[PDB]
Amino acid sequence: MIDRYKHQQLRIGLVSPQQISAWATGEVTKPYTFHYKTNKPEKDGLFCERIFGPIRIRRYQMGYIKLTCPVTHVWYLKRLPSYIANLLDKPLKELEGLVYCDFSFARPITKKPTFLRLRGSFEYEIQSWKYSIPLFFTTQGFEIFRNREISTGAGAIREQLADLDLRIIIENSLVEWKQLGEEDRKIVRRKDFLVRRMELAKHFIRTNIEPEWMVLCLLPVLPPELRPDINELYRRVIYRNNTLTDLLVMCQEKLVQEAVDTLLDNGI
Amino acid sequence: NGKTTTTYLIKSLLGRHNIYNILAVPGRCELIDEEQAFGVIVDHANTPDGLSRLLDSVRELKPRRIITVIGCAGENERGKRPVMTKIATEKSDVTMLTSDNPGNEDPLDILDDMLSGIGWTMQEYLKHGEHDYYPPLSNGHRLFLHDVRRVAVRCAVAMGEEGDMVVVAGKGHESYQLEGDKKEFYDDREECREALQYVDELHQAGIDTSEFPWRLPESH
Amino acid sequence: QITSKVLVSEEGMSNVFLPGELIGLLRAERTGRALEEAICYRAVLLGITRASLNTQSFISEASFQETARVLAKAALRGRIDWLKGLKENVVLGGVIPA
Amino acid sequence: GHYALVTQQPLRGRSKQGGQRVGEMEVWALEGFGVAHILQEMLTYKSDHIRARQEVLGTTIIGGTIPKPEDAPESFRLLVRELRSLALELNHFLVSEKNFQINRKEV
Amino acid sequence: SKGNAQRGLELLAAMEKLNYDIRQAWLILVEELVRTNHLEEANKVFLKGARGGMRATDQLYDLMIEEDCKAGDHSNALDISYEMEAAGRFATTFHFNCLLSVQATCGIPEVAYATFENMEYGEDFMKPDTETYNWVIQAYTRADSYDRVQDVAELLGMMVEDYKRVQPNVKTHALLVECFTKYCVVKEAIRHFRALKNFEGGTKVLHNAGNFEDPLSLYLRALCREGRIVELIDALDAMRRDNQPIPPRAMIMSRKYRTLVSSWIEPLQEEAELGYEIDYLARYVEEGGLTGERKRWVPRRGKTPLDPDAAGFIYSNPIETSFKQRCLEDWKVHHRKLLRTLQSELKEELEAQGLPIDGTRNVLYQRVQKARRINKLHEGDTEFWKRRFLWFPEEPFEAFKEMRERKVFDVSDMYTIADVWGWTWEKDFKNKTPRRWSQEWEVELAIVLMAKVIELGGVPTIGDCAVIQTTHSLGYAF
RNA sequence: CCGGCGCGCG
């Protein structure tokens, strides 16, 4: 007897901004849901007929929200243990402060040259960096090279994730694990963190997932017929994102991130 | 040789090469003076022979230390990229590195082609940058590098010292920048003027800008 | 199902297994006879809840408990479910393989 | 009759002329019996398969044999969109046992 | 004979209309169509006949399956096998191996594993043989994505447990060496390469004619990177006896223009003196800097290796380890094993630096304040363990006797891959005190390796010899 | 044709 072979599979995976655009292509730009008088779908709104379809396709057609600033995914930062913190190898407190407080990260990227001795996450603002360096380096060129030595928020996280060398991560983790072994509570927990980090970095190499997708550049929008509460949270994202692009300031950047976190996962 | 220099003087200088021009200037060793303890000149030499000639000419003017800024274009002159950086390293103490006109070609690859003449690459240089330490050359010289000419020449101007000298080359009297396909407007003389204008505050603000990385006061 | 897994010991470093990894008992013994690459393991007793969260299907775990935790961990590594179980095909509305 | 707007499943309640729920405990009993085709009836084209609900209404009136749905019910498509809203993509693939060609099911 | 399948079908229909038995004519037509090389029409006619209730001979079934699988047509072969099993002839290991020959190249190991599971837990005539294990292993080691080292290891264990009925061949060891090389399990690759050496061809099979990235070159590179120079020399002898020239991938040239000849001595990733300045202009010109074909060593965003040497491995090549370091590591691991079986005040600041002068008074203070400016074993011996082996009681030996009496475990279950596959040489590479590294040993090994690489067709560079009369024999000059 | 609160039946 030859078995009647059936090879069927389904796979989840972290999505890319390009695939989000391919889903939408179709961007929701206005927070208006419906007309107060005519009870018609507002154009470019959460229920736009052009974006989603005539009033079957409205159950499946997706949209997206073009966020001015990248926002981290709450599942991959705030859930314990943090995946972003483990892959970046930093304590959760400093990452949360970088995302939620007025903290700036020194040396966020490596694959481009720098010229400063700024390391770590300096909580206080650098006095020289406020006036001295920008006033000597003017504005246009300074902003051109600005996002290479000091940055803040989820943009710094995305920059750190994008330029990560996973193989170097695996090798450093393995050598540190060997050093720890060749030498008793967190002498083991540090080892367990190291084992968890190489297994996390190994999975990225063999898959098509990118660790920078853990910070969102676009926000997919649920089809309208599935949300005839969720609508209110979608307006807030547009409410605070459209405010942010009008400015272009740090406080509004945090407000957009909190709107996405509440929409994605509250009570966390 | 010196046709531009001769015509301007006839219609109306540093080194012994310009002395014969007087006996018989925009983009030809245009001195940039802002009451500093050094000098800044601009030359159009984008060729190894002319660059070598001028770099030899600087030595005869008795400079205490030699600092040079060099670059190369993209999609062209691919067969002689490392020679300028080789001669600059063998003729100058601390040499800044950048591009001349990257064009469509990515400037990072050309800047890698710079270090090929010394036994380095962008990978090794950037690993040096991560460890915030740059061991000197074989002949005791120093090497620093930056992708964009802007901050590179700003730091070079900030590194003008007493009896010292800084060369920025590759552009000359041309006042355009070639990135991708758009010819951006960029003047080396005016940018050097601006850098010389406001050099004081960067050094007096507690920042030891003497070398990469700068020893910031609160960064240790 | 309670007594079908072993725990890779904290000192077992290899490219086949990592320390703390939960592997099947039969697989562990088979690799023991074939490799001598520090295949160190100890028998572990799993409860009916912990065992149900270490299955070969992420749909079965997501529909059992901690849906957000299961889906977040799985979606990071592109996990593939081959729908060999009864509950997986119930979710899809297809015919169960029984 | 009438179905829910989102889940597209039959309504709940006698006053609303709704249907009876086949809970997970009822699904276990059917799996214990091995009646895999009774279970699929009450999972796809008696609950939420919009396309297959309409054809069952037509075939039974003419008595011309009911075929297998082969597509996904609206409850699974509803879950896929929700997972898309969390930046997660869930794709269903069929691998042919003949020529090993991967077929992406519409979901 | 002419390939006129439709004419043959019309003649068969005419035969049927004339109340004739068309089975013999159908068989003759199918066989003729196969012989004349019309496999498509032969398959169509055979499938028409089989679906019509007609039964073919065993020879015709086997011919159809084998030809279809040789042509890469898995669909027709699977259909014909299903029809043959419907007609009353069950599939054996031959038909299953024919089917597996095509599934192993589909890029999805699960198809081949489903077929293997069908074979393994079936009847006696469907049981897997060496070819089946080879097909499934090849399917798993050449997967498109995800790791499969665990699957291959478990499959190898299952094959080992089937020793009384199955034994390996050259392809088994070649596939295992390739798998354990791509995943950087180097010691297992060395074991299986030792097993593979005894087969003629051997490393030639592992070479795979350069296809599949040329795993033989990967084996040589993995041996070189970890400083397993004795094993590298043994591999070189293996290819020399097999008349296998060292491929260019194995002879890849390092960052500092070095190769496997000089990469494990105390100058690591550095050049030698060479007696003169290095011609960097020549290096730039010869590397393709004239036509834009150079390889720029700048890091880039993406999960791809910048180093061309890492191409082929699953998670990049093994890290560079000198032969001096590898010998010291082997000395330490042996002695860690030996210890295991046995049990069964300002001057203090000077130690943090190089102690420059100092000693009398105030020199220590000035230096401490100015220092801030810079800121017997029996492994593998199954017989010994079998001898030692001879409510479950808490006493370990009483417990062992209990599992012997309750048939939980017995000495008949104590065997490894070594003692069931006839690996008699394995006991000569274990339970031995490792040789201490020495400069004389390293230089003699370097000379031997250089000679063996030269005689194999691989030319070492001038920088390789500079690290070390043979230097000038290659055409060089200091 | 949406959710909360209260009261019930097996």
mmCIF file of C-alpha atoms in Angstrom, chain A residues 73-86 92 96 265-268, chain C residues 66-70 72-73:
data_model
loop_
_atom_site.group_PDB
_atom_site.id
_atom_site.type_symbol
_atom_site.label_atom_id
_atom_site.label_comp_id
_atom_site.label_asym_id
_atom_site.label_seq_id
_atom_site.Cartn_x
_atom_site.Cartn_y
_atom_site.Cartn_z
ATOM 1 C CA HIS A 73 5.836 46.473 17.370
ATOM 2 C CA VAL A 74 4.664 46.111 20.966
ATOM 3 C CA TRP A 75 4.729 42.301 20.812
ATOM 4 C CA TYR A 76 8.466 42.301 20.066
ATOM 5 C CA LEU A 77 9.534 44.978 22.576
ATOM 6 C CA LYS A 78 7.253 44.938 25.627
ATOM 7 C CA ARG A 79 6.496 41.208 25.882
ATOM 8 C CA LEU A 80 8.815 39.321 28.225
ATOM 9 C CA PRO A 81 11.440 38.240 27.327
ATOM 10 C CA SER A 82 11.934 41.022 24.770
ATOM 11 C CA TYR A 83 13.060 39.814 21.354
ATOM 12 C CA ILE A 84 14.422 43.216 20.300
ATOM 13 C CA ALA A 85 16.360 43.558 23.558
ATOM 14 C CA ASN A 86 17.834 40.065 23.211
ATOM 15 C CA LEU A 92 14.978 46.345 28.635
ATOM 16 C CA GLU A 96 12.075 51.383 26.895
ATOM 17 C CA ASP A 265 -2.096 45.297 22.260
ATOM 18 C CA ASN A 266 -3.549 47.047 25.304
ATOM 19 C CA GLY A 267 -3.081 45.919 28.893
ATOM 20 C CA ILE A 268 0.642 45.305 28.418
ATOM 21 C CA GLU C 66 -1.423 32.136 25.137
ATOM 22 C CA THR C 67 -2.384 32.918 21.554
ATOM 23 C CA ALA C 68 -0.394 36.161 21.401
ATOM 24 C CA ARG C 69 2.748 34.591 22.870
ATOM 25 C CA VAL C 70 2.589 31.581 20.535
ATOM 26 C CA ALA C 72 4.623 36.219 18.199
ATOM 27 C CA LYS C 73 7.300 33.570 18.756
#
